[PDB]
Write a protein that binds this ligand. Structure first.
Ligand SMILES: CCOC(=O)C[C@H]1CO1
Ligand SMILES: CCOC(=O)C[C@H]1CO1
Ligand SMILES: CCOC(=O)C[C@H]1CO1
Ligand SMILES: CCOC(=O)C[C@H]1CO1
Ligand SMILES: [Cl-]
Ligand SMILES: [Cl-]
Ligand SMILES: [Cl-]
Ligand SMILES: [Cl-]
Lengths: 250, 249, 250, 249
């Protein structure tokens, strides 16, 4: 069983790769930095069980993995872009293009590249990591929220056609997941350290804590196991009960 | 840990008990048939890893399990009631009351009975098994669809208050799960044999099969493992892609 | 064209009755207080254009209206119950029964009582006023939120069967609508007066204001006009953008 | 007040312009055909209460209307693109880019161009006409369904930030609205004549007819009247009950 996890150093990246690996999958990993064989090797050394790739774009990643490791059973399209809090009139239209390109076109591209071998083998699983920002409660986050909703709708739409061919498709829409060293999107500093921040997580999520990489990885692994294919189409809000807003005063 | 699965013979019951058990939970099982000794012992003999309980009403069941076993960590409120397709004006009000009694009042009563215990220890898991009928595509299913939505909304709402106390709350909202010889809600006959049933499922569900007990058990067990408490509040659409509608002709 | 509006003194009651009336409907009104012909008459005197009823329960209301005024074209099931912020283990099961009875069984009962004449005339409109508390962000509001979600699901389910017979069914799920004198659910005091309260509406809704009776009445009247029957099934969140939660700190 | 309705000849266009106008708004109308003088004047002559504009691209259109008419109060982004049913692997990436360009980038561009003006005066209305396809029951509609969801999510999101400035934002998400001789998306032939089309609509929609231009115009006009700004953020499912699925056989 062969898996690919994209952007392996951020967001849901590590939780996913590490848990799948433990589950017995051969896990190919992609990251922008794996461009420099510098960075690639310091990661092969640190994680002998994962197997990182240099390839960057969807089709060369899929061919590279198919060639080296057999055939992709599992795609985890762990998608990232920076989050800027501009209001609408202050963005460039091109900014939305780049945002959509990053969060919406990318997973289309990955799924479009993997789909026909999965369909031929009548087997595979496809998971997008999106965001609870879709139809969420934030302001001045317009580009990000819509692009992410794009990607979750893609996942649901795709399930509908691939179910014929035994291929479940899922979206995982997180908020407040511990990214650790990565800035995408809840790095320890300042999210564990800054008092103001620990107060914010405390006020607005219901479990009054950040989620964990391990939690995110366990779900990915559960979905990837073939244990619950009937859930196909589901958007999972991976968010600890966010949002919670206080009772009336007085 | 200790789980209670209600109406174990039906709907999501067997998948939940079998699979919980398989996962080393201690599983007490409620059923309307366990009110008779003979029905109970037969079950205990067929499924010696489960412990079937005789108690029927909510408060009585929870104390009984707390006695025999010390604490209830995992409540699976596996709620059932007969679906009949009638138009709104052919019902009587009390038919709706009854449906709300079985589908909505009942999970509230179990949750209510177990909560303090759970909150005291700042640990536990609560799972309601509702139905994909909630905001669903059916007609003349008005009492059932709405009662199920109330139960699902109740899960979501409880998850908000009970986060404070480290208590995950979920709803599993199924359609087309294989129910063995149970008429709730997709018994293998006619659903596995009769051609017009076989084709209806091929037509309206994405994966083009029924769901299995094992898939739903696997879900419950997962939610109750503590491996992913952070999904708290989730309403799970266990419906194999349902519904799909054909393109334009 | 004949309309009935329930609990006419609270929640969406007045906005609805007054606007329908202006729209040219004969508006029968129900309120618990119309029990005492004391209260009934001081309301017929104050609103000569509305026509209040003494009848309390669904079937005697519908028969009474059908008999006096012709035939019910429009039902507005403006439903109310008190809101208590207990946690779950502190409620009596009977409390949920009373809550469900009030917010869920009542509109079932009203629609069940009106449905077959509307179906015979192949004409009518049915609107439940529910709440944005359904699947909403509050805590310790469990009974209320679920009962209200019950009632919105009813509305959506009912649309599906009555569309055959030319009958649109809608739910209107409000938050922060000015109730005025009524305590159900945003009376002027303290919602306009209390500083702490004006701050809360300001922080959590996006229009940073309470909604108005006039707004609520205009929507009801729009839905009741026969201008947009194709919307049938819709739950309208009548809530001014609630909830909004602040950006991260720092 | 002054409204702009884009792609006026198609989809939600005519209902929106006609009905806005009927409501005393001043209505500037965009279309891809108005790039030709002859196509434009013909329209102006058929519909002398509308003012058709020649400008095509987002920034150019908004300044042109602001010139001729002084301010834009109401933006109706009536967005269109051809639906073709292909499986995911039969598309090329750039087909998805193009669909996102027309359905998602485009309303963003119009909203972006008009916003400051609107925010300055702390008044205005923004309406996106998307589609009920978003979380919909279709297959092989993957690019269209997802592009439309992004646009709907964009409406919701904008409504949050633009409340601050008294700006209501909505999405109208239709299915089965009569489009006259427009192929976007339910032209009267074959949808009013051909039996298999007539029956598909009778089968899957609750009200068992098409929606009318007038119903959608009525909606837009209402949203833009300021009579109910408090619905801001709403995604409107203008789909006549769709979808309904048959009971068990
Ligand atoms: C920026 C607000 O936070 C989120 O949207 C969650 C994160 C996963 O995308
Ligand atoms: C056709 C109606 O049946 C269902 O909703 C499935 C079962 C869970 O309720
Ligand atoms: C008590 C919290 O406020 C609401 O749920 C809105 C009101 C209409 O029911
Ligand atoms: C069958 C797909 O067509 C639609 O979604 C209706 C139109 C608005 O997009
Ligand atoms: Cl996150
Ligand atoms: Cl089922
Ligand atoms: Cl309210
Ligand atoms: Cl349409």
């Amino acid at each position: 069983s062969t898996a690919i996890v994209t952007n392996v150093k951020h967001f849901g990246g590590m939780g996913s790769a590490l848990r799948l690996s433990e589950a017995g999958h051969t896990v190919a990993c992609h990251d922008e930095s794996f461009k420099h064989q510098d960075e690639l090797e310091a990661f092969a050394e640190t994680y002998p069980q994962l197997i990182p790739m240099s390839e960057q774009e969807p089709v060369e990643l899929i061919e590279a993995v198919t060639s080296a490791l057999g055939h992709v059973d599992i795609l985890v399209s762990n998608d990232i872009a920076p989050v800027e809090w501009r209001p609408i009139d202050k963005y460039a239209v091109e900014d939305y293009r780049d945002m959509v390109e990053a969060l919406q076109i990318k997973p289309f591209a990955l799924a479009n590249a993997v789909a026909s071998q999965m369909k031929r083998r009548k087997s595979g699983h496809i998971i997008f990591i999106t965001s609870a920002a879709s139809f969420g409660p934030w302001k001045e986050l317009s580009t990000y929220a819509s692009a992410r909703a794009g990607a979750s709708a893609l996942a649901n739409a795709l399930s509908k056609e691939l179910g014929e061919h035994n291929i479940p498709v899922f979206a995982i829409a997180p908020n407040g997941v511990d990214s650790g060293d990565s800035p995408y999107y809840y790095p320890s500093e300042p999210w564990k350290t800054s008092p103001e921040h620990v107060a914010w997580v405390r006020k607005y999520t219901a479990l009054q804590r950040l989620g964990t990489q391990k939690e995110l990885g366990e779900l990915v692994t559960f979905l990837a196991s073939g244990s619950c294919d009937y859930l196909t189409g589901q958007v999972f809000w991976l968010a600890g009960g966010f949002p919670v807003v206080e009772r009336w005063p007085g």
